[PDB]
Curated annotation (Swiss-Prot), chain A:
Subunit structure: In plastids the minimal PEP RNA polymerase catalytic core is composed of four subunits: alpha, beta, beta', and beta''. When a (nuclear-encoded) sigma factor is associated with the core the holoenzyme is formed, which can initiate transcription.
Location of the protein in the cell: Plastid, Chloroplast
Family: Belongs to the RNA polymerase beta' chain family. RpoC2 subfamily.
Protein's recorded name: DNA-directed RNA polymerase subunit beta''
Highest taxon of the lineage: Eukaryota
Disulfides per UniProt: none
Segments traversing the membrane: none
Purpose of the protein: DNA-dependent RNA polymerase catalyzes the transcription of DNA into RNA using the four ribonucleoside triphosphates as substrates.
UniProtKB/Swiss-Prot annotation, chain C:
Compartments, record wording: Plastid, Chloroplast
Organism: Nicotiana tabacum
Transmembrane portions of the chain: none
Primary role: DNA-dependent RNA polymerase catalyzes the transcription of DNA into RNA using the four ribonucleoside triphosphates as substrates.
Disulfide bonds: none
Residues of the full protein shown: 631 to 691 of 1070
Entry protein name: DNA-directed RNA polymerase subunit beta
Domain of life of the native organism: Eukaryota
Subunit note: In plastids the minimal PEP RNA polymerase catalytic core is composed of four subunits: alpha, beta, beta', and beta''. When a (nuclear-encoded) sigma factor is associated with the core the holoenzyme is formed, which can initiate transcription.
Family statement drawn from the similarity comment of this UniProt entry: Belongs to the RNA polymerase beta chain family.
Amino acid sequence: NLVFHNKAINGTAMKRLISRLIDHFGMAYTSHILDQVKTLGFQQA
Amino acid sequence: RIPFLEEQVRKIRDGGKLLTMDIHRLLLNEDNRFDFVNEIAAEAKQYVENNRDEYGAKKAILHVLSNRMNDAGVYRAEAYMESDPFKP
Amino acid sequence: CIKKGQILADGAATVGGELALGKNVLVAYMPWEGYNSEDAVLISERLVYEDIYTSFHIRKY
């Protein structure tokens, strides 16, 4: 149920997204989400 | 129902990310996170004082956490030990 | 024939009368699977079996 994004995502956008996911899901879900985001970012780069 | 999702589930079950979820779930019913640590330490000491070698599968703390998670309706392995059957 | 001031023998970290503290290697600048997210280098295995960056060290006791 995450917001669909169609614009560029800079560092501040990622920081705000993580700060909102910590409050909405918790640290347990956010850790795995951040790990998967890291993997996808490394693959794309 | 995503079809291609079994790989990361197996990775979670194997790498040991289940304990990170179980600790956070158990910290949802306790007010202080220090009394919970003290209670777990006391229970582990009482369980290791009875049987020295038979503290569980490998350790006692993991055994205590598995016993606490199995009494709430969540099936967990004995002391979170699952060997790899594909090791030659 | 030789003159005063010309090289008769070489030395360590010197070849042809010039300082030589390293080797020439083919290098590309690109991100590679996060192994160089920080300041880090992903080297090839050729530098191990071709005796490129091999050095000697002598310790006394």
